[PDB]
Design an enzyme around this catalytic site. Structure first.
Site, PDB file in Angstrom:
ATOM      1  N   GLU A   1     -13.352   2.104  -5.537  1.00 25.65           N
ATOM      2  CA  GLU A   1     -12.265   1.677  -5.331  1.00 25.65           C
ATOM      3  C   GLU A   1     -12.244   0.329  -4.299  1.00 25.65           C
ATOM      4  O   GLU A   1     -12.159   0.743  -3.186  1.00 25.65           O
ATOM      5  CB  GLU A   1     -10.566   2.550  -5.608  1.00 25.65           C
TER       6      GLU A   1
ATOM      7  N   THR B   1      -0.735   4.089   0.338  1.00 24.25           N
ATOM      8  CA  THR B   1      -2.063   4.992   1.161  1.00 24.25           C
ATOM      9  C   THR B   1      -1.585   5.399   2.898  1.00 24.25           C
ATOM     10  O   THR B   1      -1.168   4.342   3.079  1.00 24.25           O
ATOM     11  CB  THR B   1      -2.842   4.885   0.337  1.00 24.25           C
TER      12      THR B   1
ATOM     13  N   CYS C   1       1.553  -1.440  -0.076  1.00 23.55           N
ATOM     14  CA  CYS C   1      -0.035   0.433  -0.346  1.00 23.55           C
ATOM     15  C   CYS C   1       0.848   1.622  -0.026  1.00 23.55           C
ATOM     16  O   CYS C   1       2.045   1.318   0.969  1.00 23.55           O
ATOM     17  CB  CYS C   1      -0.487  -0.477   1.195  1.00 23.55           C
TER      18      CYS C   1
ATOM     19  N   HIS D   1      -1.083  10.636 -11.712  1.00 25.47           N
ATOM     20  CA  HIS D   1      -1.296  11.934 -10.621  1.00 25.47           C
ATOM     21  C   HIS D   1      -0.359  11.997  -9.908  1.00 25.47           C
ATOM     22  O   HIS D   1       0.756  13.219  -9.403  1.00 25.47           O
ATOM     23  CB  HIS D   1      -2.548  11.124  -9.469  1.00 25.47           C
TER      24      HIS D   1
HETATM   25  C1  LIG Z   1      -4.741   2.438  -1.721  1.00 23.48           C
HETATM   26  S1  LIG Z   1      -6.631   1.576  -2.146  1.00 23.48           S
HETATM   27  C2  LIG Z   1      -7.736   1.465  -1.803  1.00 23.48           C
HETATM   28  C3  LIG Z   1      -9.127   0.996  -2.044  1.00 23.48           C
HETATM   29  C4  LIG Z   1      -8.622  -0.247  -1.641  1.00 23.48           C
HETATM   30  N1  LIG Z   1      -8.253  -0.460  -0.415  1.00 23.48           N
HETATM   31  C5  LIG Z   1      -7.748  -1.206  -2.655  1.00 23.48           C
HETATM   32  O1  LIG Z   1      -6.908  -1.741  -2.261  1.00 23.48           O
HETATM   33  O2  LIG Z   1      -8.935  -1.087  -3.994  1.00 23.48           O
HETATM   34  C6  LIG Z   1      -6.710   2.329  -4.228  1.00 23.48           C
HETATM   35  C7  LIG Z   1      -5.698   1.774  -5.008  1.00 23.48           C
HETATM   36  O3  LIG Z   1      -4.800   2.003  -5.682  1.00 23.48           O
HETATM   37  C8  LIG Z   1      -3.788   1.128  -5.683  1.00 23.48           C
HETATM   38  N2  LIG Z   1      -2.418   0.913  -4.550  1.00 23.48           N
HETATM   39  C9  LIG Z   1      -1.845   0.668  -3.811  1.00 23.48           C
HETATM   40  N3  LIG Z   1      -0.990   0.375  -3.261  1.00 23.48           N
HETATM   41  C10 LIG Z   1      -0.094   0.872  -4.344  1.00 23.48           C
HETATM   42  C11 LIG Z   1       1.082   0.736  -5.268  1.00 23.48           C
HETATM   43  N4  LIG Z   1       2.018   0.711  -3.963  1.00 23.48           N
HETATM   44  N5  LIG Z   1       1.461   0.844  -6.583  1.00 23.48           N
HETATM   45  C12 LIG Z   1       0.406   0.839  -7.473  1.00 23.48           C
HETATM   46  N6  LIG Z   1      -0.986   0.991  -6.530  1.00 23.48           N
HETATM   47  C13 LIG Z   1      -1.441   0.613  -5.275  1.00 23.48           C
HETATM   48  C14 LIG Z   1      -4.766   0.051  -5.013  1.00 23.48           C
HETATM   49  O4  LIG Z   1      -4.429  -1.591  -5.665  1.00 23.48           O
HETATM   50  C15 LIG Z   1      -6.491   0.093  -5.596  1.00 23.48           C
HETATM   51  O5  LIG Z   1      -6.556  -0.551  -6.868  1.00 23.48           O
HETATM   52  N1  LIG Z   2      -5.704  11.702  -7.794  1.00 18.50           N
HETATM   53  C1  LIG Z   2      -5.772  10.202  -7.325  1.00 18.50           C
HETATM   54  N2  LIG Z   2      -6.112   9.633  -7.805  1.00 18.50           N
HETATM   55  C2  LIG Z   2      -5.913   7.996  -7.351  1.00 18.50           C
HETATM   56  C3  LIG Z   2      -5.263   7.910  -5.396  1.00 18.50           C
HETATM   57  C4  LIG Z   2      -4.892   9.172  -5.547  1.00 18.50           C
HETATM   58  O1  LIG Z   2      -4.378   9.112  -4.795  1.00 18.50           O
HETATM   59  N3  LIG Z   2      -4.752  10.124  -5.822  1.00 18.50           N
HETATM   60  N4  LIG Z   2      -4.892   6.860  -5.488  1.00 18.50           N
HETATM   61  C5  LIG Z   2      -5.644   6.259  -5.417  1.00 18.50           C
HETATM   62  C6  LIG Z   2      -6.991   5.858  -5.314  1.00 18.50           C
HETATM   63  O2  LIG Z   2      -7.042   6.730  -3.433  1.00 18.50           O
HETATM   64  O3  LIG Z   2      -7.913   5.254  -4.881  1.00 18.50           O
HETATM   65  C7  LIG Z   2      -6.766   6.124  -6.729  1.00 18.50           C
HETATM   66  N5  LIG Z   2      -6.623   6.742  -7.550  1.00 18.50           N
HETATM   67  S1  SF4 Z   3      -5.836   0.420   1.426  1.00 17.89           S
HETATM   68 FE1  SF4 Z   3      -5.825  -1.410  -0.739  1.00 17.89          FE
HETATM   69  S2  SF4 Z   3      -3.568  -1.562  -0.704  1.00 17.89           S
HETATM   70 FE2  SF4 Z   3      -4.240   0.093   0.962  1.00 17.89          FE
HETATM   71  S3  SF4 Z   3      -3.579  -1.985   2.671  1.00 17.89           S
HETATM   72 FE3  SF4 Z   3      -5.693  -1.929   2.624  1.00 17.89          FE
HETATM   73  S4  SF4 Z   3      -6.106  -3.298   0.327  1.00 17.89           S
HETATM   74 FE4  SF4 Z   3      -3.905  -3.360   0.553  1.00 17.89          FE
HETATM   75 MN   LIG Z   4      -3.674   6.347  -3.781  1.00 14.18          MN
END
Ligand SMILES: C[S@@+](CC[C@H](N)C(=O)[O-])C[C@H]1O[C@@H](n2cnc3c(N)ncnc32)[C@H](O)[C@@H]1O
Ligand SMILES: Nc1nc2c(c(=O)[nH]1)N[C@@H](C(=O)O)CN2
Ligand code: SF4
Ligand SMILES: [Mn+2]
Ligand SMILES: C[S@@+](CC[C@H](N)C(=O)[O-])C[C@H]1O[C@@H](n2cnc3c(N)ncnc32)[C@H](O)[C@@H]1O
Ligand SMILES: Nc1nc2c(c(=O)[nH]1)N[C@@H](C(=O)O)CN2
Ligand code: SF4
Ligand SMILES: [Mn+2]
Ligand SMILES: [Mn+2]
Ligand SMILES: [Mn+2]
Lengths: 209, 209
Positions: free
Chosen positions: A115, A50, A48, A203
């Site tokens: 998402e 985020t 993750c 982004h």
């Molecule tokens: C932060 S997640 C939040 C929604 C939900 N937890 C999920 O995994 O779909 C938002 C999107 O960012 C993607 N994402 C998270 N960490 C990532 C990473 N290190 N590289 C690429 N995509 C990433 C996830 O796969 C998801 O499609």
């Molecule tokens: N602009 C923007 N779009 C996004 C992300 C994010 O952090 N910024 N990360 C993902 C999210 O938080 O769902 C997917 N789409």
């Molecule tokens: S928010 Fe989505 S990408 Fe981040 S830890 Fe949870 S399932 Fe994984």
């Molecule tokens: Mn994101």
């Protein structure tokens, strides 16, 4: 009652709707990772990018009810403009997103996208369903709008994903120390298997929220 | 008989179909610019980033009939794979693209997309019509799939474009000495008028053909 990390207005950076203006509602908490760095190495989802821990972000807090949350969302949209669009994310939004919130958003002229990681069941009244399957989590959502798979993951069965009931199939390069490596892999994957499309995290290239 | 600058297999880098694997057939010659730098300063379209002069590029040349061109196009696609998709561009493809070629491509299982400047009438049997209006040229194509406008151009009536019969309205930053500057402008435009979505030239960020 809803716990929200942050709410902001920007362009959707990922997926089929990339470039489209939307309000991002980032719910707090996820079912596949606690969000603390000490637990990352043993979590079900470990890559993750985020911060979904807490409610201390921009426009983030604990919300009274549906109407109270919608008021903050609708207030970030440009005045007098239509085409209202909210992306529910996190965190894992299906831990909190319920039918009354969906209805309050629809009533406020919003189209709703989500998402989600696919481990939780989803409300099908949601207008755009984006599933990003984690390889070590169960996948219970097997139909939706786009399947956005972050590659590469171990134990990943990529070709099987293309047998599911989605309109769009995307692979997205895993960000981290090898983003450049993973980007070339994703590109190669799509050119070898053109059913798939490349989802860039734009982004991070535009340097916008 | 068709004059083709280059034919190559890659990902569509722009528009609603960004990230999608496609064979690009770049036709030689345009009606809004000769192609030579001496004439750019006084041409109708003066910001082109492309070389469409000649038939010397990869897989380029003059093609006897439609069947010869289709053979080269189909030969670049991964074997045993479907989802066949070709982007006819240039140059201004509507100078040479005709009904025999369109039918021959369809017969080969190819879905056809076009990148056109909108100054010439298009074949409505084309599956994806992308129109990119040039501010100082006539616009005779007022319906299609996506309207991808490069900004900023002078004498440009941007909001007027939003009232045409298209499904997607995109703004794309003009590449040149001010790409970063024009990108900021494009983002801001979409956030102010969310009917519009951002179109990046992603292939320039991935550094791919
Ligand atoms: C932060 S997640 C939040 C929604 C939900 N937890 C999920 O995994 O779909 C938002 C999107 O960012 C993607 N994402 C998270 N960490 C990532 C990473 N290190 N590289 C690429 N995509 C990433 C996830 O796969 C998801 O499609
Ligand atoms: N602009 C923007 N779009 C996004 C992300 C994010 O952090 N910024 N990360 C993902 C999210 O938080 O769902 C997917 N789409
Ligand atoms: S928010 Fe989505 S990408 Fe981040 S830890 Fe949870 S399932 Fe994984
Ligand atoms: Mn994101
Ligand atoms: C080279 S044109 C070929 C098709 C046709 N001549 C047209 O203009 O649509 C392909 C696409 O690239 C876009 N383009 C050309 N030069 C550009 C530049 N400097 N910056 C951004 N986009 C550009 C055009 O607007 C068009 O959408
Ligand atoms: N990958 C890729 N996609 C493109 C372009 C290009 O040069 N490369 N330029 C434009 C074109 O020639 O049609 C639009 N899409
Ligand atoms: S109309 Fe298209 S191909 Fe012709 S000069 Fe302008 S951008 Fe280039
Ligand atoms: Mn943070
Ligand atoms: Mn180009
Ligand atoms: Mn050249």
């Amino acid at each position: 009652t809803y716990a929200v990390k942050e709410i902001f207005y920007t362009l959707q950076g990922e997926g089929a709707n990339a470039g489209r203006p939307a309000v991002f509602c980032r719910f707090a908490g996820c079912n596949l990772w606690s969000g603390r760095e000490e637990d990352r190495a043993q979590a079900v989802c470990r890559f993750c990018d985020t911060d979904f821990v807490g409610t201390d972000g921009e426009n983030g807090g604990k919300f009274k009810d549906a109407d109270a949350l919608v008021a903050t969302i609708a207030g970030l949209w440009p005045a007098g403009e239509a085409h209202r669009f909210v992306v529910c994310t996190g965190g894992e939004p299906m831990l909190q997103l319920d039918q009354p919130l969906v209805d309050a958003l629809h009533a406020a002229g919003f189209g709703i996208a989500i998402e989600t990681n696919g481990s939780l069941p989803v409300l099908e009244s949601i207008d755009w369903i984006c599933v990003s399957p984690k390889a070590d989590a169960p996948l219970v959502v097997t139909k939706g709008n786009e399947l956005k798979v972050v590659i590469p993951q171990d134990n990943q069965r990529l070709a099987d994903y293309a047998k599911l009931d989605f309109e769009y199939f995307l692979v997205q390069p895993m960000d981290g120390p090898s983003r450049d490596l993973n980007t070339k892999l994703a590109i190669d994957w799509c050119k070898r298997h053109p059913q798939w499309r490349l989802s860039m995290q734009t982004h991070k290239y535009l340097n916008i929220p």
